[PDB]
Nucleic acid binder design. Structure first.
Ligand SMILES: [Mg+2]
Ligand SMILES: [Mg+2]
Ligand SMILES: [Mg+2]
Ligand SMILES: [Mg+2]
Ligand SMILES: [Mg+2]
Ligand SMILES: [Mg+2]
Ligand SMILES: [Mg+2]
Lengths: 287, 54, 110, 95, 24, 152, 52, 54
RNA sequence: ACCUCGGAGCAGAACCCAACCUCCGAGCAGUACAUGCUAAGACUUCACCAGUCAAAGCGAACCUCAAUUGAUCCA
């Protein structure tokens, strides 16, 4: 354009005409002279000029504001609460339409990390990613997804098109493993087994209305029929679809992966996988 | 009245409802000094947890 | 990042439309991002200033500025105070105008 | 509040602010009126109800509580059963 | 269309003995 | 391929089939209180943005075959204010911004109306806030009657 | 002169309040509202923790 | 006529019964000019009124 | 001589204003505990900490005086 036409002439651009963008480099103020001199911008004498000032919050013997108020159970045990990153169905459909989330493979946590739709932090007490029913309307995907926390509306909207919701629990170690598996493989330690949910999550993960991974599969169709009668719409049968073998991937626990197995050391260099032998190791990994 | 509007005027029966003006609320400031916790619910649209980019 | 697959109904849901092929004979041009999105964002400086910035502007900035001014004139009644920045492909427009500019750039040919 | 420590050289917080206040992501601190549990036999029920309300702070108080804390207490938490989840985001704001 | 459907969205009442008959 | 002690098949030996969790129980859950969706005309004619969605559903009540005669007559008599001119039962809700919640609320309303229309022995709660003046006016209008004969 | 006592309810144990009383009189048996019952039950003076 | 019942023009009103040339007490011998029509008050409307102008 | 607060003139007709200017006082009381629970809108002792009035609903038969007082921690 005109930029190259104007740059065709004129002397060369070397280290002799380096002009910084105006407004970014502000001149440095020096307390020397008449404008910024005398007191160097410190006012009159006293503690304001000598620098011997009390700490932030001291009101000169008067009881400060943050002391006269009694304590209350606001942040009692915030370092032990279970936090879950939100995930709406609208953003899931957006990722599927863009292509970063392919609806042909089972979607769990590592797939969402690779697609970079949610940011799962191994620290800050995060036990997975929850599900949000904000994108209920205009949601046509039909794909199984494994969510740690899925609401009733979200599960219903997923089952309308023909999806499978799997509620599973993982310890923070499993979260760190599933987030970035490449450094876990470069580590050199074998794949551990999944840990059981705590005492305050067994009735939640062993229930039928929550689609847990430990509940009996005999109460799932009843809950699906109840949700179909509640939220309307005729419930379709996935037994006649072509992707029946893909939706049946319920992910057996004590795996924290997919097609691998706990105790299988993974080596990046030289594509070879080693199987543990003996019998105590197998009994411990299959317990 | 239904039968009258049906077999006497050849039209539909109009309905009404005694509506009331919305309640008055001052301008929502940035720092509500000395206000209860329910001050944010006075200007809230829907009482449901909304989600933006998430 | 791979390219998005060509859908069957181009009115693809969740608000997304791919740019058309041989785009129109215009002095200016608006590029895309990594996620194949329309570069129409918002920005705030202090606590009351509100404007939108089109960070991808390639070509004649004055033409696009005049076009958006004539488009936003009937929506405000006055002249939108904009900044014609040429060193960078930016064009700040005072006021919350995000979805409107997105729809205009999608229907224009970008 | 120790602007520079002797081991990490970072900024430290005041645990009293955390135990006596609760900061929301919008930029507001939830406090409690003092004297809501002592000498309740000489107070009218209206005063007892007024003292048992989550009152917000002011501008200088919020600025002081923010300066007394670091960047960890100014994030956004996503608890499972958070009763103050609807108060994190503040809608319908016109300067 | 029916010409007798002139109802209008707003309907007024010119009776003073009306507001107290509906407890409003 | 892999399975441990805490597997799905070992914890529940009675449920080991590959399709035991997807078999739709349609043959054992086809009662008359299911509300057929093929004869319902559900439409959405509102998109507010005060973000609330409207889900209007109407159906010809006089041609409903899944409803018995006495319960239909009772629900038509006790709800004669929501019937359209062509015999359409217009029922809508305005609570949530999602269409699924509004549809579920409308279905629940229809279900409770059906289950209360059949139950005739229902104790009516005596209220005194809006019907007392109506009863007083009716009694005062009935009191001023003292003629002898009138036809028409 | 006066004294502050606590009244325990007969029905629905767990709700108690405080009320003033003379020091040279007997106990109290008044009618106070009970939120767990939403009615009116009896209250008996029991355990004084104030001597004003 | 009904003072309250006109849906279009608020200041105007409707017509119900109208007679003319009534030979004194003979209210059955005069000519007719407007068929009788029962009142049709709206649902959500207030309390309408009809006055007999003789 | 005083260490907290209220009233009368200084300060006269919206408001605020001090003195080691001159006077009355108060650290309580005579009777029922719905002296129950929520919830629009304001004044605010010249800042803050504090105090006070109240629309309406569920619940029930159909409150007087002027100051009249005590926070953080802990038990
Ligand atoms: Mg000096
Ligand atoms: Mg000095
Ligand atoms: Mg010092
Ligand atoms: Mg001191
Ligand atoms: Mg910015
Ligand atoms: Mg003030
Ligand atoms: Mg009241």
């Amino acid at each position: 354009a005109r930029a190259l036409d104007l740059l065709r002439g004129l002397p060369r651009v070397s280290l002799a005409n380096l002009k910084p963008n105006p407004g970014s480099k502000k001149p440095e103020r020096r307390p020397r002279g008449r404008r910024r001199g005398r007191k160097c911008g410190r006012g009159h004498k006293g503690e304001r000029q000598r620098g011997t000032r009390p700490r932030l919050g001291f009101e000169g013997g008067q009881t400060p504001f943050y002391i006269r108020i009694p304590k209350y159970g606001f942040n009692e045990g915030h370092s032990f609460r279970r936090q879950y990153k939100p995930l709406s169905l609208n953003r899931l459909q957006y990722l599927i339409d863009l292509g970063r989330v392919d609806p042909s493979q089972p979607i769990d946590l590592t797939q969402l990390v690779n697609g970079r739709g949610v940011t799962i932090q191994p620290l800050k007490r995060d036990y997975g990613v929850q599900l949000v029913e904000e994108g209920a309307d205009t949601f046509t995907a039909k794909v199984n997804i494994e969510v740690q926390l899925a609401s009733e509306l979200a599960i219903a909207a997923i089952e309308k098109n023909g999806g499978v919701v799997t509620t599973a629990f993982y310890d923070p170690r499993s979260l760190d493993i599933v987030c970035k598996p490449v450094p876990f493989f470069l580590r050199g330690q074998p794949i551990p087994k999944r840990m059981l949910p705590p005492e305050e999550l067994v009735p939640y993960y062993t229930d039928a209305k929550n689609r847990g991974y430990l509940a009996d599969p005999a109460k799932f169709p009843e809950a699906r029929l109840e949700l179909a009668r509640k939220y309307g719409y005729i419930l379709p049968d996935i037994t006649k679809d072509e992707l029946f073998k893909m939706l049946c991937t319920r992910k057996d626990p004590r795996q924290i992966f997919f097609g691998l197995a706990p105790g299988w050391v993974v080596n990046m260099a030289d594509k070879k996988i080693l199987k543990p032998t003996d019998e105590n190791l197998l009994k411990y990994y299959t317990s | 009245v239904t039968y009258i509007f049906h077999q006497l005027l050849d039209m539909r029966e109009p309905v009404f409802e005694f509506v009331r003006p919305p309640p008055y609320h001052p301008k929502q400031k940035r720092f509500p000094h000395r206000q209860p916790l329910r001050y944010l619910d006075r200007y809230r649209d829907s009482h449901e947890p909304t989600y933006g980019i998430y | 990042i791979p390219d998005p697959p060509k859908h069957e109904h181009y009115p693809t849901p969740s608000g997304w439309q791919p740019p058309r092929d041989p785009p129109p004979n215009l002095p200016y041009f608006v590029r895309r991002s990594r996620m194949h999105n329309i570069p129409v964002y918002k920005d705030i400086t202090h606590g009351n200033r509100q404007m939108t910035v089109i960070r991808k502007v390639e070509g004649d900035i004055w033409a696009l500025q005049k076009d958006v001014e004539d488009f936003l004139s009937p929506l405000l009644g006055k002249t939108p105070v904009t900044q014609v920045n040429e060193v960078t492909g930016t064009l700040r427009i005072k006021g919350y105008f995000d979805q409107e500019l997105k729809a205009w750039l999608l229907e224009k040919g970008f | 509040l120790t602007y520079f420590s002797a081991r990490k050289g970072k900024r430290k917080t005041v645990k009293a602010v955390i135990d006596r206040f609760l900061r929301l992501h919008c930029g507001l601190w939830v406090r409690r009126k003092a004297g809501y549990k002592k000498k309740l036999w000489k107070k009218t029920p209206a005063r007892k109800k007024r003292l048992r309300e989550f009152v917000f702070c002011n501008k200088t108080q919020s600025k002081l509580l923010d300066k007394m804390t670091t960047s960890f207490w100014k994030r956004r938490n996503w608890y499972v059963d958070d009763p103050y989840q609807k108060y994190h985001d503040r809608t319908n704001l016109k300067v | 269309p029916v010409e007798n459907e002139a109802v209008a969205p707003e309907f007024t009442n010119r009776n003073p003995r009306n507001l107290e008959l509906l407890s409003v | 391929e892999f399975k441990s002690i805490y597997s799905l098949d070992k914890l529940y030996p009675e449920s080991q089939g590959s399709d035991t969790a997807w078999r739709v129980p349609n043959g054992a859950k086809q009662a008359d209180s299911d509300i057929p969706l093929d004869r319902l005309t559900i439409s959405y004619c509102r998109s507010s943005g005060k973000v609330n969605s409207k889900a209007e559903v109407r159906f010809h009540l006089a041609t409903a075959e899944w409803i018995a005669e006495p319960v239909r007559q009772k629900i038509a008599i006790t709800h004669k204010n929501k019937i359209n001119r062509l015999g359409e039962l217009i029922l809508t809700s305005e609570s949530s911004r999602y269409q699924f919640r509004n549809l579920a609320d409308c279905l629940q309303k229809i279900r409770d109306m059906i289950t209360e229309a059949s139950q005739t022995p229902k104790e009516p709660t005596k209220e005194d806030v809006k019907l007392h003046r109506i009863r007083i006016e009716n009694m005062n209008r009935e009191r001023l009657r003292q003629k002898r004969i009138h036809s028409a | 002169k006066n004294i502050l006592v606590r009244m325990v309810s007969e029905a629905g144990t767990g709700f108690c309040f405080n009320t003033k009383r003379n020091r040279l009189r007997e106990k109290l048996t008044l009618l106070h509202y009970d939120p767990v019952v939403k009615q009116r039950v009896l209250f008996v003076e029991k355990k004084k923790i104030r001597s004003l | 006529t009904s003072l309250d019942g006109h849906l279009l023009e608020p200041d105007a009103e409707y017509l119900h019964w109208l007679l003319t040339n009534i030979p004194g007490n003979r209210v059955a011998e005069g000519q007719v000019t407007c068929p009788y029509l029962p009142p049709f008050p709206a649902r959500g409307s207030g309390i309408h009124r009809l006055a007999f102008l003789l």
